[PDB]
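Why predict the complex rather than its parts? Because the way molecules touch one another can change local conformation, and only a joint prediction can capture that. The input here totals 755 residues.
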Amino acid sequence: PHRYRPGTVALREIRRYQKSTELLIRKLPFQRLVREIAQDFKTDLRFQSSAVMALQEACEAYLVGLFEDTNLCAIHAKRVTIMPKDIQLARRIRGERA
Amino acid sequence: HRYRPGTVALREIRRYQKSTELLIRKLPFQRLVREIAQDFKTDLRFQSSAVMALQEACEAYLVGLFEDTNLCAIHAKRVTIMPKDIQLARRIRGERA
Amino acid sequence: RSRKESYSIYVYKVLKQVHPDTGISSKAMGIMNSFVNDIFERIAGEASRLAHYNKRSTITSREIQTAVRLLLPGELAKHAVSEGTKAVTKYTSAK
Amino acid sequence: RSRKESYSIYVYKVLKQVHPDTGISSKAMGIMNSFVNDIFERIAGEASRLAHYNKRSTITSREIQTAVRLLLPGELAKHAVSEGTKAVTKYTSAK
Amino acid sequence: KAKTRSSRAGLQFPVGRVHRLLRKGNYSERVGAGAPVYLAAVLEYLTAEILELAGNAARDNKKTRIIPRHLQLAIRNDEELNKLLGRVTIAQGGVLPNIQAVLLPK
Amino acid sequence: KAKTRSSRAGLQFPVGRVHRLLRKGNYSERVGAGAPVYLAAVLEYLTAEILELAGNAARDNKKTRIIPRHLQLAIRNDEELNKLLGRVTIAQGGVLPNIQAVLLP
Amino acid sequence: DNIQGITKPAIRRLARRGGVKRISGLIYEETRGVLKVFLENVIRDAVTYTEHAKRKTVTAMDVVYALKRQGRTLYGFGG
Amino acid sequence: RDNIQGITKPAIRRLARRGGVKRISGLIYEETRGVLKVFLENVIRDAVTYTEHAKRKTVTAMDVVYALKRQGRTLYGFGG
DNA sequence: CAAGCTTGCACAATCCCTGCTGGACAATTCTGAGTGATGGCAGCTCCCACCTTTCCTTCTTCCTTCACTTAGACTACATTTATTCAGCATCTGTATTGTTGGAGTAAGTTCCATGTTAATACTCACCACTG
DNA sequence: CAGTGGTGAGTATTAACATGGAACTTACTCCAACAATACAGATGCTGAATAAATGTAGTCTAAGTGAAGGAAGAAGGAAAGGTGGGAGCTGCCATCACTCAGAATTGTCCAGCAGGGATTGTGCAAGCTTG
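Output of the joint prediction:
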């Protein structure tokens, strides 16, 4: 039948998700993660729905920007794949450590 | 005799990381500062403390920038730092605005 | 049962002034409120620091002008300064 | 002539309380004046914004406490909160 | 017999509300009379500029309602406005269409 | 009769000066009574920690006097003062002596 | 953990939005760690603001203030 | 006019050594001079703005410190 | 150059959602004493730009010599594309505590102005850490 | 072998403390509307596990080239001075612009009602891609 060459649907997804605006992590697992992280600070802590949505928007935008910097790091090393060391380099040059 | 290429480089690295004085010469930097300033507003006067402060700022900025450039170069599996590494450090760092 | 502050009415008026046929979402009007509030706070805080630096006790339009020159980029700063100066001139010559 | 203002005597005092055999330069003294001024400004601005959020009108010790928690990292925040609580308790108990 | 200061300056932003916000928000213990006029003019100018760019980016995509995506587009595509809002995350706006030419097929 | 608020608080920083600065720094209308005490205690703790670390560094250099370089070593060699002061540049303080592994021969 | 609720396809779609064309298999754990650290910081500061509010429901204002404190100003959630 | 060349190649090498840089290309020096010039442009522009506000002709160290705190690179030891 | 899987492009019909009016009321605006912050002027120090002079610490070429970047070869890992099947997100729905606002009272608390000392900044003189 | 730069008395300044008298911020209930957990069920996108192929990353080897390192000749910068001198910093003197303080009045903002924009699906156009 039909088998697209490796990479072309990657470009298709790139174009789609750079054309879209909606969030890219399912709402409920992120809500669970937020509440789990909050429980380490104070108990019986209730969240506004807008609070969880703001946290999700923030985390998504942060991860997107970090991925763009990681991709520039990977292109620098003449690769096309992103690697954990690329993330580490980006987060060191940005400062997001210590 | 002749030192191998790399021993003098590391000796310089250790020495200049040990010391704390201003690696640029005072007067040429001051002339540069003054020409930039006059390109902003004409016939400004400065303060010796102000030009010294500008030199401290600029050298700290450039030392940090070269540290980031070295990180980029080592990432690209090199030891030679090239302008593309400075450009990558600046772009990731956030100076492309 | 309380009232709430917003810039929505005036943003809408300016939008009708610059694009009389296009409306605006509610999410976008919230965004415009946040943007106006942020820029207001940036400019006011910078002017306050300017006032403390010179040991003055007043934000005049001059501290606002210097804060705009400090905070906005080149052409944006020039146009904003001209807009503000013309607005103040129109304000003064009308009693 | 005029008088200038700094924390030189007090930095000197604390240094003597932690290193009786150690003296301090003058350039380092200016550095520590700048550091103290910067930290004071950070905590004061954070407490101002904290009160302005909660529609209060007073910087109490609680605003400074929350600002010290916000600005400083973990162990520094813990020990700074302990020091502040100790000092305010002694001050109240001596009033 | 009361002409509002917004009209007296020919502005659409509230000069009086801005003056009150300046007085409450304790920036200095005394606030000049040209400060609110100037600040309202500046805020209304910047609002108008972003709204013009967003209206252009909405008419571009065959729409009559500006949404957060259009504000993201109008900001990230302008050099000055993207420099003013470099560290500003806009909700439900996405990113600019951008693919590195290295990753494309030859 | 008169006793300073610093001695009463058991402090070394001036509670009165800090109270004046808060009252004139334009942070709100009213400033509570325990606020300057709390703030001066925090400032004295922070300066005490930096002084401790810098004095240890100066002794490690066999120098009786603290210079900017010692402050730089005290800051950048700690894990939390480095975070609190990561965007701060110390004048004439130099940089920590570090060389990357690969650049070593 | 619930940190695994950020699935592989979610991180892959996020990488897609950022222009990434090919993703190693060890990206996912590292990205989960980065995301958890960022969330830790932001929720720590948000809960701090909530506690100073004498409250126990974390409003969107507390989140926006924590993010602005972190230098990551957010628009569209009031104020 | 054109005093930027006074930032000689040995100066850039010394800065690089303090930054832990082992080998340096010859194309660095131009990029480094451009980077330094733009950084100085920003800082001196803000410092001169501060000086103009105070209706002065001298650019003291206070203006430099304030303008460096604006850019996000606060400096300790010249007051402020 | 034919055949595929993906996307853009055009209609039908909703749904909800941004317009749109309209009473209520807080917040602006007008006006007038009251007043203190801020221009405006003189005068003074003082540090800032300009100039002269050796004395060398740096800079600049220049060769040359080697280590390091880069280009091509080439394998296997390793990511990718599609598939199929549970399975967990989702979307209303509904009750339920609980928690946040909003009023009304009441008093600690802070401001405020005054009088007075005691802490500081600064000024002369003086030796000990630092080259 | 050295000395410029951290430190003792005295002293004028001033601002912090003491102390007593008013507004006023908030704390402290008390109550009463949203509204965020909490199940809970139908449904249905979607992710997770897997096989196949293929196409990148990593390792290698070899030219080549370009950067460092040392050698000598200039060479500007700096370090010490003097010295004019324009500007910042003070203090006095108005004086006018900002602040309360109290009535009118109206701009705006929740709360209810409606036309229309995106929207969601249903089907052509087409269209790049893979062979």
